Amino acid sequence: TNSDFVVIKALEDGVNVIGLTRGADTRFHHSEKLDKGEVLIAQFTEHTSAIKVRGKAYIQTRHGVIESEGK
Amino acid sequence: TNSDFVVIKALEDGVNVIGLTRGADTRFHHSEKLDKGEVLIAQFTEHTSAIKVRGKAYIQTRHGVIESEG
Amino acid sequence: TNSDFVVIKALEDGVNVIGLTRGADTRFHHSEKLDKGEVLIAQFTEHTSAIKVRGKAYIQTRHGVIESEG
Amino acid sequence: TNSDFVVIKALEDGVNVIGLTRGADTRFHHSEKLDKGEVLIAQFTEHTSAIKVRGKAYIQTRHGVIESEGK
Amino acid sequence: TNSDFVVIKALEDGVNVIGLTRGADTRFHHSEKLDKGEVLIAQFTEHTSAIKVRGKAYIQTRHGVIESEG
Amino acid sequence: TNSDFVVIKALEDGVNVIGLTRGADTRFHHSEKLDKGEVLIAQFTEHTSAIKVRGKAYIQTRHGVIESEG
Amino acid sequence: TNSDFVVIKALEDGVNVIGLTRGADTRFHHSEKLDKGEVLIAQFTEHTSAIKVRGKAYIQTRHGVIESEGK
Amino acid sequence: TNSDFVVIKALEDGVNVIGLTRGADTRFHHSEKLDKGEVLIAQFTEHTSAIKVRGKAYIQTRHGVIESEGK
Amino acid sequence: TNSDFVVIKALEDGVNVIGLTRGADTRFHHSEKLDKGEVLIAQFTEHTSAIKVRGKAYIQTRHGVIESEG
Amino acid sequence: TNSDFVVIKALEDGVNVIGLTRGADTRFHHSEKLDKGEVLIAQFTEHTSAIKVRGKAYIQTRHGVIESEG
Amino acid sequence: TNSDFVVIKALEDGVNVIGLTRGADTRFHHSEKLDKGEVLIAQFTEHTSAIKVRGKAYIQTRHGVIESEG
Lengths: 71, 70, 70, 71, 70, 70, 71, 71, 70, 70, 70
Ligand SMILES: N[C@@H](Cc1c[nH]c2ccccc12)C(=O)O
Ligand SMILES: N[C@@H](Cc1c[nH]c2ccccc12)C(=O)O
Ligand SMILES: N[C@@H](Cc1c[nH]c2ccccc12)C(=O)O
Ligand SMILES: N[C@@H](Cc1c[nH]c2ccccc12)C(=O)O
Ligand SMILES: N[C@@H](Cc1c[nH]c2ccccc12)C(=O)O
Ligand SMILES: N[C@@H](Cc1c[nH]c2ccccc12)C(=O)O
Ligand SMILES: N[C@@H](Cc1c[nH]c2ccccc12)C(=O)O
Ligand SMILES: N[C@@H](Cc1c[nH]c2ccccc12)C(=O)O
Ligand SMILES: N[C@@H](Cc1c[nH]c2ccccc12)C(=O)O
Ligand SMILES: N[C@@H](Cc1c[nH]c2ccccc12)C(=O)O
Ligand SMILES: N[C@@H](Cc1c[nH]c2ccccc12)C(=O)O
What we know:
11 copies of one chain form a homo-oligomer.
Chain A: E1 5-10, E2 15-21, E3 28-34, E4 39-43, E5 48-54, E6 57-61, E7 64-68
Antiparallel strand pairs in A: 1-4, 1-6, 2-3, 2-5, 6-7
One tryptophan sits at the interface of chains C and D.
Function (chains B, C, E, F, I, J, K): Required for transcription attenuation control in the Trp operon. This trans-acting factor seems to recognize a 10 bases nucleotide sequence in the Trp leader transcript causing transcription termination. Binds the leader RNA only in presence of L-tryptophan.
Keywords (chains B, C, E, F, I, J, K): RNA-binding, Transcription, Transcription regulation
Family (chains B, C, E, F, I, J, K): Belongs to the MtrB family.
């Protein structure tokens, strides 16, 4: 429960924050839908070892700021 | 007990800090409502591995400041 | 017992620092009342995984200064 | 025996540094009274997970300086 | 679990982020296709000890920024 | 044996550096008397979880410099 | 799964990133070919305790930037 | 055996570095005399949880420089 | 498996990076030959507790840059 | 095998670097003589919990530079 | 296997890097001869708790640079 985390702010409606399964197999286990202006703060966990952001978002990680772009 | 935490200051009444379940499943287990000017300082835990904020709020984490908008 | 802590200085009477329970269940277990000018320094612990401040206060955490407003 | 500590310097007589119990219960377990100019350097411990300061004092923690103020 | 991670932002369609198997044997176990403007934040794990990026992408690691070329 | 320590330099004769007992009970277990110009470097330990300085002294900790007054 | 990693960007076709075996024995166990513009981010592991880069590449480690030169 | 240490440089003959016992009891267990210009680098240990310097000395610790003054 | 590492870049042909055995005995167990412009990133390990560089090379460690000379 | 270390450079012949025993008992167990210009890099260990330098020497520790004088 | 290491570059022929035994006993167990311009990167280990450099050499440690004079 001490893992890194990412901060995602949706810059439009319908931004998808997608968790990919930890392990030998890689698939999406969850998509969190964010509407404009909502903020999600999400850890890497026993179940999530990779995170995909789809749509326009402002993203902060330990390595700095990055922005996803929609459509 | 040592884990990261988030600071959320409500900038309007009814800000909703939403704790999502750690584990194979993902659903909210708790929603803490804040009135304007109230501050919540909240850890990631055995039970919460993601936090969502709805409503207008000033948020600080280890990565800096971010603001949610309602 | 080296987890993080928050410093709260009441800027008016009747400030409440509230501890939220760690675990599957989330409820308030203690509200500490601070009057004007008193300072509480409070850890995250086995029993407290989130802290709510109600009323006007100057707060310090590892992420910097925030102020709760009455 | 590795915890954070607080430094408290009394700026008037009768400063109370109060230890609150670690655990499911929260209660006062000790009040240390300081005369003006005395310095207490106090850790968080197995028994103390929250500290209250009453009266005028100069306080240092890892988060910087704060001052308590008296009635 | 507390591992390092890599941030990849596709600057064109069809970018591939490829995980290479941890262990005595080295082969591809997964490729994640990213379209333009999508962001992947991927850890090293029990199963992935090297990551290859093919196509035009903006990459952030602990060592700074690097860019792959299409 | 890796706990924090405090540096106390007595600025007058008769300075007392007092160790308070770790545990459920809080009481003075030792008072080290310092004369003008002597330096005591003292750890927090299994037996000492709080230190009180009485008398005029220049004090250094991890949080910086502070001075006790006569 | 905590080790350091190396970032390799190929500046020409046919760059080889080569892993040397951990243990009493030292030999190449894998050579990953990178074409121009591809980026490999590769950890030290239970099986790799040394990494050789051959060909023209831009390399980042904790210690800073370095460039391999081909031919 | 990775604890803090203090550096003590005698600025006159007869500087006395005094090690105080770890434990419920507190008394000195060792006194190490230094002549002018001699340097002692001394750790906190299983047996020493506090160190007292008598006499004129230049002292460095993690918290910076401090000087003891003689009598 | 997270020890320190050295970065060696050969500035001429025939540079040798030589691993010395960990343990009570000290002998060379491997010499890696680097030709001009090749880079070797080599850890200290269970088997290697000292590394010797013979020949002209640019070297980076945690303590900074050093150059061996042929 | 991971402790702090001290660097000592002899500025004259006959510099002594003396190890004091770790434990309840304190005594010199080794004295390493350094001639002018020689450098000794010496850890704290299971057997050495204090180090004395006698003679003119340039010394480096984590806390910076200090000089012993003959 | 993550002790500190020292970097030694010989500035003349015949530089000796001597390892001193860890333990209650202190003696030289190995001396590594370095010719001019050769570089040795040597760790502190289970068997080596002090390192002596004889001859003219440029040295880097975590505490910065020092030169032995030969
Ligand atoms: N139940 C999920 C919640 C989660 C955390 N981080 C995520 C990132 C994306 C999607 C879901 C999540 C988990 O513990 O892993
Ligand atoms: N009982 C919850 C309290 C909590 C901590 N962080 C939160 C964030 C959001 C909502 C609830 C919480 C827990 O230990 O997980
Ligand atoms: N008994 C409580 C004391 C406490 C610590 N931090 C708090 C924050 C708010 C309220 C009470 C507390 C506990 O150990 O958790
Ligand atoms: N199931 C994969 C998911 C993953 C994490 N990082 C990756 C990098 C590339 C490809 C897949 C991944 C794993 O845990 O290892
Ligand atoms: N299977 C290899 C993958 C690898 C990691 N780093 C490398 C560097 C070079 C070559 C292969 C690798 C391993 O776990 O070690
Ligand atoms: N016996 C108390 C001493 C103490 C430490 N920090 C304190 C803060 C306030 C009051 C008492 C204390 C304890 O070990 O917990
Ligand atoms: N035998 C003593 C040596 C010592 C270390 N630090 C000291 C400070 C003062 C006096 C003696 C010492 C010990 O291990 O504790
Ligand atoms: N015997 C005491 C020595 C001590 C360390 N720090 C102190 C501070 C004050 C008084 C005594 C001490 C102990 O180990 O705890
Ligand atoms: N098999 C060797 C490989 C190696 C790592 N670092 C080295 C430095 C020099 C020579 C060989 C090596 C080992 O694990 O130790
Ligand atoms: N076999 C020696 C190699 C060594 C490491 N560091 C040294 C310093 C000097 C001489 C030899 C060494 C050891 O593991 O300890
Ligand atoms: N055999 C000694 C070698 C040593 C290390 N540091 C020292 C300092 C002084 C004298 C000897 C030493 C030991 O392991 O402790």
